[PDB]
Amino acid sequence: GSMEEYYMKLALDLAKQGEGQTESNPLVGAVVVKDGQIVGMGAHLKYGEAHAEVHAIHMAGAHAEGADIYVTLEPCSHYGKTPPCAELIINSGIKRVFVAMRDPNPLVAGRGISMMKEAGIEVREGILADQAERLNEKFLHFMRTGLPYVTLKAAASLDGKIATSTGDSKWITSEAARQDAQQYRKTHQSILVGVGTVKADNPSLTCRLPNVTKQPVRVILDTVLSIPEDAKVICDQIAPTWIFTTARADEEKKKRLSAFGVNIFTLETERIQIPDVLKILAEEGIMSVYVEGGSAVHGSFVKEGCFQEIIFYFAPKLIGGTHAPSLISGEGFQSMKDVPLLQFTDITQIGRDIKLTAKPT
Amino acid sequence: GSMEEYYMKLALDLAKQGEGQTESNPLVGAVVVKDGQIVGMGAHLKYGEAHAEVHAIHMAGAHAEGADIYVTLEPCSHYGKTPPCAELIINSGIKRVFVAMRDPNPLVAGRGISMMKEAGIEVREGILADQAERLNEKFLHFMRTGLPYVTLKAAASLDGKIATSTGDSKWITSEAARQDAQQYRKTHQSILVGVGTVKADNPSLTCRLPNVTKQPVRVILDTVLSIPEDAKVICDQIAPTWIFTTARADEEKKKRLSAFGVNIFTLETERIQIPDVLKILAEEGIMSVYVEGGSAVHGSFVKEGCFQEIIFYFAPKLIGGTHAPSLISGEGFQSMKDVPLLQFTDITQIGRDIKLTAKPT
Amino acid sequence: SMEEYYMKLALDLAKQGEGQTESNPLVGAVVVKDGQIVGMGAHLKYGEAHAEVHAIHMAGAHAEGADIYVTLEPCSHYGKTPPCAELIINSGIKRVFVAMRDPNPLVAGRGISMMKEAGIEVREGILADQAERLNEKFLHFMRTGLPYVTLKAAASLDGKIATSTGDSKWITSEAARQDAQQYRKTHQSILVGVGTVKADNPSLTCRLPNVTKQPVRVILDTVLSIPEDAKVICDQIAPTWIFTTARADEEKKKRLSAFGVNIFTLETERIQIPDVLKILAEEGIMSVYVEGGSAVHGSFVKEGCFQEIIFYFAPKLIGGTHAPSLISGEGFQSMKDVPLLQFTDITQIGRDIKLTAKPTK
Amino acid sequence: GSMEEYYMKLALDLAKQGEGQTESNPLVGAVVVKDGQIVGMGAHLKYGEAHAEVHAIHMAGAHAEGADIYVTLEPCSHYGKTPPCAELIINSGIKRVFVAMRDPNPLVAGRGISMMKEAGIEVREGILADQAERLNEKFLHFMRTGLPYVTLKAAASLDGKIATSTGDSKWITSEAARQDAQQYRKTHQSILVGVGTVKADNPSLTCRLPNVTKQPVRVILDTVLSIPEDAKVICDQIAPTWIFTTARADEEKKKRLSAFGVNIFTLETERIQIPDVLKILAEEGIMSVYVEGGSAVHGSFVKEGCFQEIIFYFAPKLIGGTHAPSLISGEGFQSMKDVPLLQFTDITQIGRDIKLTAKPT
Numbered sequence A, B, D: 001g002s003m004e005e006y007y008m009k010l011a012l013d014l015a016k017q018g019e020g021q022t023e024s025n026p027l028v029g030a031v032v033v034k035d036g037q038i039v040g041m042g043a044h045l046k047y048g049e050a051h052a053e054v055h056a057i058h059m060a061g062a063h064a065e066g067a068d069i070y071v072t073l074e075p076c077s078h079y080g081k082t083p084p085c086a087e088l089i090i091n092s093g094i095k096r097v098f099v100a101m102r103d104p105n106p107l108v109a110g111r112g113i114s115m116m117k118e119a120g121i122e123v124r125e126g127i128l129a130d131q132a133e134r135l136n137e138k139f140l141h142f143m144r145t146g147l148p149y150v151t152l153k154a155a156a157s158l159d160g161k162i163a164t165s166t167g168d169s170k171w172i173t174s175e176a177a178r179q180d181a182q183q184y185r186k187t188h189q190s191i192l193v194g195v196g197t198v199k200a201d202n203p204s205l206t207c208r209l210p211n212v213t214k215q216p217v218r219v220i221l222d223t224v225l226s227i228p229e230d231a232k233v234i235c236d237q238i239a240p241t242w243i244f245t246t247a248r249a250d251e252e253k254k255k256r257l258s259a260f261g262v263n264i265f266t267l268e269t270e271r272i273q274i275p276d277v278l279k280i281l282a283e284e285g286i287m288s289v290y291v292e293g294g295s296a297v298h299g300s301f302v303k304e305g306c307f308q309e310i311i312f313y314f315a316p317k318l319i320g321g322t323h324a325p326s327l328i329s330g331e332g333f334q335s336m337k338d339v340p341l342l343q344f345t346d347i348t349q350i351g352r353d354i355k356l357t358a359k360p361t
Numbered sequence C: 001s002m003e004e005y006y007m008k009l010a011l012d013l014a015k016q017g018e019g020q021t022e023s024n025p026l027v028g029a030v031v032v033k034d035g036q037i038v039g040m041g042a043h044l045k046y047g048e049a050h051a052e053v054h055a056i057h058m059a060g061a062h063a064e065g066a067d068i069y070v071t072l073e074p075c076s077h078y079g080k081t082p083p084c085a086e087l088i089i090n091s092g093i094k095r096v097f098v099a100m101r102d103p104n105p106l107v108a109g110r111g112i113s114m115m116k117e118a119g120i121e122v123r124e125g126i127l128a129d130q131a132e133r134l135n136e137k138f139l140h141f142m143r144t145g146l147p148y149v150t151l152k153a154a155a156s157l158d159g160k161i162a163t164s165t166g167d168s169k170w171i172t173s174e175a176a177r178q179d180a181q182q183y184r185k186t187h188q189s190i191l192v193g194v195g196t197v198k199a200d201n202p203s204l205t206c207r208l209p210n211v212t213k214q215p216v217r218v219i220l221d222t223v224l225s226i227p228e229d230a231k232v233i234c235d236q237i238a239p240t241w242i243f244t245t246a247r248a249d250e251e252k253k254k255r256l257s258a259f260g261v262n263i264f265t266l267e268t269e270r271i272q273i274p275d276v277l278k279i280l281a282e283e284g285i286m287s288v289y290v291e292g293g294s295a296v297h298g299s300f301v302k303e304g305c306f307q308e309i310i311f312y313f314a315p316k317l318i319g320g321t322h323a324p325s326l327i328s329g330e331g332f333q334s335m336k337d338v339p340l341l342q343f344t345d346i347t348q349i350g351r352d353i354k355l356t357a358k359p360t361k
């Protein structure tokens, strides 16, 4: 093993400790070494609070002076919700710093390294950038593309059906699978679904796990605003509800809905385009979207190539039926030469079910 | 551990040396031990020829006197193509017999143990029973139930499509996967497909893997003989071809295909009944069937509940589209409370694709 | 179990302070609030903030109502600053998880009761074994009052530490000697009899990639016949302490003191191991890595003063009736008087085999 | 991964089944393959009985005509206890022959391969020669060197003492490891010790494992024939007892013992030389010798380099004692550069003891 590597490693593991506590902020670890001895360690633990460097340097005490510091992400240079870390590093008299990777965030891009270099501080980057990458996939993708990180999820029988030819779907996959699916209602800032789902299952789309601290944004794709006005996603006040329609939506009805706190987004088109929906979500602050329902909705996402992750749960059952609804509705790909290739990322059993996850290639 | 278990293990390993050589006969092994030494070893190597016991007892010679013998399957007691092995055992002076499991057929079951018990021989049962069962899974099924061991095989995209909405399916699963499937055209006595597949692809349905001892019987399902005599099995019958048709199956055709070697069967009904087909083959000495033909065919087998194994190859590809052929078509179950629950027995990544195999409860 | 997850994190945090705490034990601490990790800490510098202090300070306001996991009983005495148990009480923490109690019989349980008395819930035992391993040597020193002793020896497969001519330069491999180097990092002192210094003139220094400190080199030299030009007396690389008796020459002791050598004069005719151990403890040496000295080893064994024994065997055979064996000296008279040890580990390093054993109770 | 070597692996496995029934004869296996099918199998199961090729060809019946045969050893062409199998192969109609390795008996070797080739049989050879070599390690050694295959076994403390300075040896290693030691008194044709080991233990050197059959030859090294007139070996009558002595052997006493069944070999040297006794022993048919003698005896064997294998049993104990006897005494090597390098073969714990086995390189 290496020594500069052991330190960046410790920083990555320190980073993991904030997983799911930092909301929109990324996971970050910081470890200060002075005279070959660890004197400070830190991690971003809570959104809106001290960053990793702040904790590490404050712990470092007076050994901060002339010491080294390893950060999994480049020290921020902006005056946002927290003061600049780059500034804290230079004002604490840190000799040299090691950054695993640059913060793609528009208002920090490379700016944090320049701010420390011009102050004489030696900056080195690259150490374990691969794992630093695996640490904040969503945040990163969002900062680099401007579009939310999209995950598509569906449950189905082993022969690919999502219900019988009569629409029965009461028990396709076990409770263990459903419970596993709930994790995603936490790693994602929003749950996305078509109104067909609301009309059919009148879901709560809210997370029913333990660490309830910030319900996810519930997005509804409703082309002609036919959503039932009595629906949970409208009269439960449990979480933010955003609906996307077109000019074909009824003005009066549209006024009644916002009266309940629902935020409507009227698209200047005839058929809700997925790409416009994503861009708008990104612009409102949504960094991740968990697309749960609408085989047609999944179809639009798959056809336009707007997904980073695909997650299917297969049950050891066979539904059959020529007219039984399949996993992906909509247009579809004409011939094989046009169908995109994906790669399986994880195959794991959950109860009696199988969970296959794949990603674009 | 146990020495008894070692001998039975050895017998089991000897039995396998005849795989794919014993035809309809089950694999069987035997080892004779005298005064703690191995003096005889044997297995069934050729159909219609000596059984394991005949080989082992011969090799043992005078050592068979007062010795023990371990056999994987109950020693025959009838008069097929070899005199009763129980008699051979009795007259060799063998004192004790270790039997893994009894004979499948309900009429000849235990008749062997009884004879030997009558002659004063000690018969022990159960040692490595489970492994003996796996060695002749299909055979044991045939005898025990009176019907073929059915295996349904299919390959589809991750979203369960057998082809694009425009019939294209030229590239779904990897060649490595297509290759892994060939191992089934070797372990099954028959391969079954529907005429739909015949005219759509014009398959050979022949085992290409290195072993070429005999040709899996090519069973085709037709209803009116729309099968293009212009190709496939018809032309150059590399192996036996059997077609199941219905009364209204023309006349000049029915007696025209018999002109080659095609054995045409004709069902009474107007609707080809699966349970009738499996019974017909069971009569024809076919002990196992490998079904890969059309989604409809699989649908029938599934609705009828006539299958012991399901093997699905999933490619990391999303074909999508409504009207894109799915894995199983036809009737299917309308109520989710009527969908039979199966169990996954093996997950295996093959090339880029995933191989799922489930068996019924 | 989240309990174990948090203690494990506290344990891993404690490790970061290895070799940086002098006589202070390694300790980790993590503060959890509403299911979230809000504070982390470990003792990193001798004479500086304890783990509980870093963790609690990081937790900030979140400490109120929070949970804290600590690998060792929080101190409870009143020195320059408030004890850690008092800190916890003040911060508003409602539950404490302690892996193990203070080793000092006079303090054990003191911090616990101090915290319960303030209405705080205290749970003990979580990962005690690991918390025990973390400070093994420290714990032993604190419990018995003597240093933790490891005896190490390299020898041919037949028990010889050199040929009959004294030739021993490399019986074991480079890899094996490099491995043994590790114990020079984990012990505060390395010990040998003068014989080793006369025969091999070793430096007895720790030459690992990272060495912020050198272990005290202790020499047992009855008559003070050590060569004044030996490395241990001239390299100035590490402290060198010698134990002699009254037979030692005063002017020589003066010459050696001028070189920085620490000489202890025992009031006995022979050097007693129990006395040197006692004097080393009085000087603060909690661990001793004993190598050179078949006679030295013999004394440590006959007196029963070792906690662990490590033998490196080489795939070699050196004969010799006069070749030196592993443990010279008196030895046990009868096989019923020989204490039974227990193999703790068996590993192969390069072409050699490393065996470690510890006595039994 | 080829069928070519699968068949040979099989033959090897078949041959393994006669282990410890072969006696002097080597374990051999044969597989007859006709038109891609295993039609016959065999192995040498009993001494003086049929060779592998016999059983296999018989079982192959008429399928032997124009078939192949894989043998783990060159088919014998001489008339020993049974006729020539090479003759058999030919007269059977078999055309190809795969031999794994040629015969060791120089005069009796080569012929087989030649005898066959002379009949038009294509003889390929070398397949799995590696495995075939370990199968009969001792046998091949004896035939290739004319010397017995030697094994040195010893049981000592972890510090290399085989007794206390009092001579007390009342069990260093556990009974479990003592029983593990018995296995060798079953696989070696003779067990050897020095007279010292007799007039200080009066062992019987007899075997005590189920199915004892023949009892190994007991060889004693007695320089002056001072062996006690009454000793379990002299008068037990359990097993043969050979003694090697010199000129200084009392003629009277020599005669007495000869009347008791003891065969005496007098050497014309002043001291007994291992190479001479190993030469005599081979001449008398002894192919292997288990040496547990004494440290002096082991020293002689090591010094001469007269051993193929060394097995040491170490107990989790420290005996100590500068005068306690060591593992290998005698002259031994003066310089580490002179010391021969061995290689660790196997490391296995037996109860609380450790069993090390090594071989010269």
Ligand SMILES: Nc1c(/N=C/[C@H](O)[C@H](O)[C@H](O)COP(=O)(O)O)[nH]c(=O)[nH]c1=O
Binding pocket: A155, A169, A170, A171, A172, A173, A174, A177, A178, A181, A197, A201, A202, A203, A204, A205, A206, A293, A313
């Ligand atoms: N039918 C199945 C699923 N289907 C469930 C529906 O998608 C349903 O709309 C959501 O679970 C509603 O979320 P909630 O009311 O807010 O807790 N999901 C599964 O994982 N397996 C199945 O078998």
Ligand SMILES: Nc1c(/N=C/[C@H](O)[C@H](O)[C@H](O)COP(=O)(O)O)[nH]c(=O)[nH]c1=O
Binding pocket: B154, B155, B169, B170, B171, B172, B173, B174, B177, B178, B181, B197, B201, B202, B203, B204, B205, B206, B292, B293, B313
């Ligand atoms: N289209 C695919 C499959 N398609 C299977 C079809 O039924 C096809 O007609 C038969 O496999 C043809 O057999 P033959 O080699 O001509 O004798 N099967 C697969 O495992 N993967 C696919 O992509």
Ligand SMILES: Nc1c(/N=C/[C@H](O)[C@H](O)[C@H](O)COP(=O)(O)O)[nH]c(=O)[nH]c1=O
Binding pocket: C154, C155, C161, C168, C169, C170, C171, C172, C176, C177, C180, C196, C200, C201, C202, C203, C204, C205, C291, C292, C312
């Ligand atoms: N004789 C052998 C050993 N001998 C150990 C002696 O005590 C030797 O003086 C020290 O290891 C020298 O250490 P230094 O590098 O000068 O600081 N130790 C080993 O690991 N293998 C052997 O063969």
Ligand SMILES: Nc1c(/N=C/[C@H](O)[C@H](O)[C@H](O)COP(=O)(O)O)[nH]c(=O)[nH]c1=O
Binding pocket: D154, D155, D169, D170, D171, D172, D173, D177, D178, D181, D197, D201, D203, D204, D205, D206, D292, D293, D313
């Ligand atoms: N002393 C020990 C051994 N002692 C080995 C001696 O060679 C001893 O004479 C023989 O094992 C005696 O066998 P028998 O009485 O003739 O059946 N061998 C061991 O493996 N462990 C020990 O502790």
Ligand SMILES: Nc1c(N[C@@H]2O[C@H](COP(=O)(O)O)[C@@H](O)[C@H]2O)[nH]c(=O)[nH]c1=O
Binding pocket: A025, A026, A027, A028, A029, A043, A044, A048, A049, A050, A051, A052, A053, A073, A074, A075, A076, A079, A080, A081, A082, A083, A085, A103, A105, A108
């Ligand atoms: N969490 C984190 C960083 N976060 C960077 O700062 C943004 C958050 O800024 P703020 O509004 O002040 O909280 C986020 O967008 C990211 O680009 N930087 C590094 O200093 N170390 C840290 O631990």
Ligand SMILES: Nc1c(N[C@@H]2O[C@H](COP(=O)(O)O)[C@@H](O)[C@H]2O)[nH]c(=O)[nH]c1=O
Binding pocket: B025, B026, B027, B028, B029, B043, B044, B048, B049, B050, B051, B052, B053, B073, B074, B075, B076, B079, B080, B081, B082, B085, B103, B104
């Ligand atoms: N092959 C085999 C057995 N086969 C038993 O006999 C049937 C075959 O009978 P036969 O027509 O005479 O070959 C098969 O149905 C099974 O129940 N029995 C055991 O004696 N040992 C053997 O090796």
Ligand SMILES: Nc1c(N[C@@H]2O[C@H](COP(=O)(O)O)[C@@H](O)[C@H]2O)[nH]c(=O)[nH]c1=O
Binding pocket: D025, D026, D027, D028, D029, D043, D044, D048, D049, D050, D051, D052, D053, D073, D074, D075, D076, D079, D080, D081, D082, D083, D085, D103, D104, D105
């Ligand atoms: N056991 C064995 C062979 N044994 C070879 O024959 C010798 C034994 O001869 P015999 O005295 O007749 O049993 C032995 O020295 C070995 O070299 N040869 C091969 O034919 N196949 C066999 O299975």
Ligand SMILES: [Zn+2]
Binding pocket: A051, A053, A075, A076, A082, A083, A084, A085, A086
């Ligand atoms: Zn910052």
Ligand SMILES: [Zn+2]
Binding pocket: B051, B053, B075, B076, B082, B083, B084, B085, B086
């Ligand atoms: Zn039979």
Ligand SMILES: [Zn+2]
Binding pocket: C050, C051, C052, C074, C075, C083, C084, C085
């Ligand atoms: Zn404290």
Ligand SMILES: [Zn+2]
Binding pocket: D051, D052, D053, D075, D076, D083, D084, D085, D086
């Ligand atoms: Zn032969």
